Structures are given as structure tokens and as C-alpha cells.
Scaffold this active site. Structure first.
Site, PDB file in Angstrom:
ATOM      1  N   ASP A  10       0.776  -1.231   0.000  1.00 12.36           N
ATOM      2  CA  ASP A  10       0.000   0.000   0.000  1.00 12.36           C
ATOM      3  C   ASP A  10       0.809   1.284   0.000  1.00 12.36           C
ATOM      4  OD1 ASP A  10      -2.609  -1.296  -0.028  1.00 12.36           O
ATOM      5  OD2 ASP A  10      -2.179  -1.833   2.066  1.00 12.36           O
ATOM      6  N   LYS A  62     -11.851  -4.405  -2.886  1.00  9.89           N
ATOM      7  CA  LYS A  62     -13.073  -4.304  -2.075  1.00  9.89           C
ATOM      8  C   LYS A  62     -14.267  -3.993  -2.961  1.00  9.89           C
ATOM      9  CE  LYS A  62     -11.035  -4.055   2.073  1.00  9.89           C
ATOM     10  NZ  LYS A  62      -9.674  -4.233   1.498  1.00  9.89           N
ATOM     11  N   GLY A 171      -5.020  -7.600   9.017  1.00  7.27           N
ATOM     12  CA  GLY A 171      -5.149  -7.078  10.361  1.00  7.27           C
ATOM     13  C   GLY A 171      -4.015  -7.556  11.260  1.00  7.27           C
ATOM     14  N   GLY A 173      -0.331  -7.422  12.838  1.00  9.90           N
ATOM     15  CA  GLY A 173       0.693  -6.442  13.115  1.00  9.90           C
ATOM     16  C   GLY A 173       0.145  -5.100  13.513  1.00  9.90           C
TER      17      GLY A 173
HETATM   18  O1  LIG Z   1     -10.798  -6.354   6.770  1.00 15.68           O
HETATM   19  C1  LIG Z   1      -9.894  -5.966   6.081  1.00 15.68           C
HETATM   20  C2  LIG Z   1      -9.783  -6.099   4.665  1.00 15.68           C
HETATM   21  N1  LIG Z   1      -8.723  -5.633   4.035  1.00 15.68           N
HETATM   22  N2  LIG Z   1      -7.666  -5.001   4.672  1.00 15.68           N
HETATM   23  C3  LIG Z   1      -6.522  -4.552   3.858  1.00 15.68           C
HETATM   24  O2  LIG Z   1      -5.402  -5.352   4.146  1.00 15.68           O
HETATM   25  C4  LIG Z   1      -4.225  -4.548   4.307  1.00 15.68           C
HETATM   26  C5  LIG Z   1      -3.802  -4.594   5.757  1.00 15.68           C
HETATM   27  O3  LIG Z   1      -2.691  -3.693   5.894  1.00 15.68           O
HETATM   28  P1  LIG Z   1      -1.944  -3.476   7.273  1.00 15.68           P
HETATM   29  O4  LIG Z   1      -1.095  -4.808   7.567  1.00 15.68           O
HETATM   30  O5  LIG Z   1      -0.997  -2.349   7.005  1.00 15.68           O
HETATM   31  O6  LIG Z   1      -2.892  -3.122   8.380  1.00 15.68           O
HETATM   32  C6  LIG Z   1      -4.587  -3.216   3.694  1.00 15.68           C
HETATM   33  O7  LIG Z   1      -4.351  -3.198   2.286  1.00 15.68           O
HETATM   34  C7  LIG Z   1      -6.073  -3.110   3.973  1.00 15.68           C
HETATM   35  O8  LIG Z   1      -6.756  -2.248   3.063  1.00 15.68           O
HETATM   36  C8  LIG Z   1      -7.691  -4.820   6.074  1.00 15.68           C
HETATM   37  O9  LIG Z   1      -6.786  -4.277   6.669  1.00 15.68           O
HETATM   38  N3  LIG Z   1      -8.810  -5.318   6.697  1.00 15.68           N
END
Ligand SMILES: O=c1cnn([C@@H]2O[C@H](COP(=O)(O)O)[C@@H](O)[C@H]2O)c(=O)[nH]1
Ligand SMILES: O=c1cnn([C@@H]2O[C@H](COP(=O)(O)O)[C@@H](O)[C@H]2O)c(=O)[nH]1
Lengths: 212, 212
Positions: A10, A62, A171, A173
Site C-alpha cells: 500500500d 473491495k 489485520g 501487526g
Molecule cells: O478487513 C480488512 C480487509 N482488508 N484489509 C486490507 O489489508 C491490508 C492490511 O494492511 P496493514 O497490515 O498495514 O494493516 C490493507 O491493504 C487493507 O486495506 C484490512 O486491513 N482489513
């Protein structure tokens, strides 16, 4: 996926995204590319990643529109080279079926997002999540996304979809989820910031892998 | 590709094909599936392999028809899940362009077969191969197939396509080609019988990898 670890890339600039992904490539083989990178650098970044790193790419979009628009989004995404796309189940079965039809036409895959990992997911999504998972089973969906932050919900979701379905979980970390506990139920974990914002992304990925 | 080694899975029965591929999976990440397996077990075997082994699949179909038929063949092949398809260049540019157009529509790749590895390739294909490779460059082709059995021809082909193009090469082992010499020019070698007819396919794959 390699080491059961999927990198959520991201970062918004192509140079940093390529740098970090290349640094952690030996620990992964699957990258989730979402709108933060695509809206900043264009859809061509998907094919670039796929070629340069030889990794599978999940488009974390999404998808949450009406059937007709969902079909167009999936078509453009698969044309860009993505191996799979994440679609929300809350907009209903017709919207999910539209995505499944394009994936079938193009020999690709759909991942159904059941419950999300952030706090707000408790407001409306959580209460519909079990039914969204059952809808997935009814529609023939074989790939799902569930929350690392709520392992008891991940367990219930695994119960509904069965052991043969593939379940990935974000989710981990930054949001509070634990790699090992999540992997008791999910097949793979999605990790973004804990790796891409680390001073040493490769060491961060190596640490997660060693912890599991 | 992993270890620069691509398995040509030309066994005809699904059970043996799955057994051997699973046994050598740690040494590869790319499998070439052709007509010997597809005509015996059906096109669904491509998606099965892709899922079960998480490998990239090249459809070794030697596409060699008129533009209209080539488009249909490529569409069906990509719909079945193949990541790439091998197309003959000898039928001409229009026939190759038809394949490239479908690959573009579907976010997939075309590999252009220039010169073949068997003895008969000297009769007609060899004399046209340099021109077929130049046609590929003119059409924007980035993936090529050339012969392990003739490293001097592989060198000339590499010269025409440039260092940035991806070149894979069959004819290793059973046909007489040498892994190491071939890899002086090709990015990856294709190996079929030396691995799948071996008493121990995994040991055979391991030996090839150690030799390079
Ligand atoms: O329920 C969900 C679905 N998708 N993501 C996605 O997964 C990644 C999680 O990133 P993170 O490890 O930096 O929190 C990001 O791209 C976020 O948009 C979530 O965090 N939670
Ligand atoms: O010039 C070419 C092009 N393709 N192949 C294909 O590559 C594989 C080589 O198999 P082998 O290692 O058993 O000889 C087979 O699928 C064969 O059809 C060749 O052998 N030579």
C-alpha cells in the site's frame, strides 16, 4: 502462498513499492495490490509487478458496486493481469455473482470478503458476516477473507466455509492481529505496514516467518 | 522461474501427472502443460494444477492456425487458466498478432517459438528462424522459445531478441541438450522426460539443478 505470508503493498510511490517488494521477495510469492498504489501509479503497475517479481497478484479492490459495474471493474482488473480480486459480500449475491462470472470467463479467482478487521466492522458487517460466508458457500466461492483481529470470528468463518476453502486474513501487526494465532484458522496472513513501514522490511518479514 | 527449470508435463494420465509434479514442486514453480495431457484429461487439468501446486502454467500448444482460429484457441486456453501460451511463428505475422491481441485482452502472455529442437527442424524451420525472431521483435513479443540442442542457434536468437527478452529452451536431456550450456543463452530450460520418466523424478530434478 510462500511462507503463508502475503504482502499488502500500500505504498503510493512506484519506486518505494518496487524497492520494498524486491527486498522481501524471497519471503513471499504473493502480493496484494490495492487502490493506494493503483490510483497513484496506474493499473499497469500490476503487470509490472507480476513480471518483475514473478509473484501472484491479488487486486485488493473491495469491489462493492451493482452487478453491472462490478463486471466492468473485474474485467479491467483481470485484463491488467491480476490473478484474483477481493470483492465485498455485503452488497449481496447478485453483486458477487457478477464478479464470479467474469472470473470464470477469464480463468481467474474471486476472494469474498466476509468480516473486516477494523473496529468499525463491528457496527454492521460483523452481524452479517456469517450469512455472507454462507452466501459464498452457496455461490461456490472457494476463497475468503476474514479478520486477524478477531480469531473467534475467524474460527466461526472457517467453520462455515470448510477446511477445503482458502482463507486469507489481514489485520496482522499494525491492527493488532497475531501471526500465529491467525494461522490456526487462516491459510495465509496479509501483512502491510509491519513490513513496508519497517526500517528493514526484509528483517521484518523474516521475523514474522520465524515467529510462525 | 524457480531454479530456471520448467517441467514439461507430458504424461497422459492425471494420477501420474499429479504424482510427478507434486514430487518435484520444490524445484520448480512453472509447469508447461501440452496436448499429451490436455487431450487425455481435459482442459480443466490446467486450473487443477494451478490451484494444487500454485505454479504458473505455460500451455505448450504450438498454435499454428489462421488468425481467426488462433484467436479462439488462445481465448479458450486463457479461459482455462493458463498464464501463457506458446505459438509458432512460421505461419506468419497475422497469426501471431491474433494471439497477442487475445493475450492483451486477457492480461496474459504469448511465447513465440522460433526454431525447434528436433532434427527435422533443420529442414524448413531453421532457415526461417532468424526472420521469425525479428518478426517477434517487430510485433513487440517479449517471450521466446529456442533450441537447447543447438546452442549456436540459441546464441544467434538471443542476439536478435536482446537481453531483456525472456527466452526458454526445450530439448534438454532426452533430446541431447545440456542444462548448463543452454543456460548461457536462455533464461530457463524446459525438461520433460529426463524428469518425468526417471525412477526418482525429484532426484533427477535435483541433479539438474545441482549441475547448474
Ligand atoms: O478487513 C480488512 C480487509 N482488508 N484489509 C486490507 O489489508 C491490508 C492490511 O494492511 P496493514 O497490515 O498495514 O494493516 C490493507 O491493504 C487493507 O486495506 C484490512 O486491513 N482489513
Ligand atoms: O522445439 C521444441 C518445442 N517444444 N518442445 C516441447 O518441449 C518438451 C520437451 O520434452 P522432453 O524434455 O521430454 O524432450 C515437450 O513438451 C515438447 O513437445 C520440444 O521438445 N522442442
Amino acid at each position: 502462498v510462500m511462507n503463508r505470508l502475503i504482502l499488502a503493498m500500500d505504498l503510493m510511490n512506484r519506486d518505494d513499492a518496487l524497492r520494498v517488494t524486491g527486498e522481501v521477495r524471497e519471503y513471499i510469492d504473493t502480493v496484494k495490490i490495492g487502490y493506494p498504489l493503483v490510483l497513484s501509479e496506474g493499473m499497469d503497475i500490476i503487470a509490472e509487478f507480476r513480471k518483475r517479481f514473478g509473484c501472484r497478484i491479488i487486486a485488493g479492490f473491495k469491489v462493492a458496486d451493482i452487478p453491472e459495474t462490478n463486471e466492468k471493474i473485474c474485467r479491467a482488473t483481470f485484463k491488467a493481469g491480476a490473478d484474483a480480486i477481493i470483492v465485498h459480500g455485503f452488497p449481496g449475491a447478485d453483486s458477487v455473482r457478477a464478479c464470479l462470472n467474469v472470473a470464470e470467463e477469464m480463468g481467474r479467482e474471486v476472494f469474498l470478503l466476509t468480516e473486516m478487521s477494523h473496529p468499525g466492522a463491528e457496527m454492521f458487517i460483523q452481524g452479517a458476516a456469517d450469512e455472507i460466508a454462507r452466501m459464498g458457500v452457496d455461490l461456490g466461492v472457494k476463497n475468503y477473507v476474514g479478520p486477524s483481529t478477531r480469531p473467534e470470528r475467524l474460527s466461526r468463518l472457517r467453520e462455515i466455509i470448510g477446511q477445503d476453502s482458502f482463507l486469507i486474513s489481514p489485520g496482522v501487526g499494525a491492527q493488532g492481529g497475531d501471526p500465529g494465532e491467525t494461522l490456526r484458522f487462516a491459510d495465509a496472513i496479509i501483512v502491510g505496514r509491519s513490513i513496508y513501514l519497517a526500517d528493514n522490511p526484509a528483517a521484518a518479514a523474516a521475523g514474522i516467518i520465524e515467529s510462525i
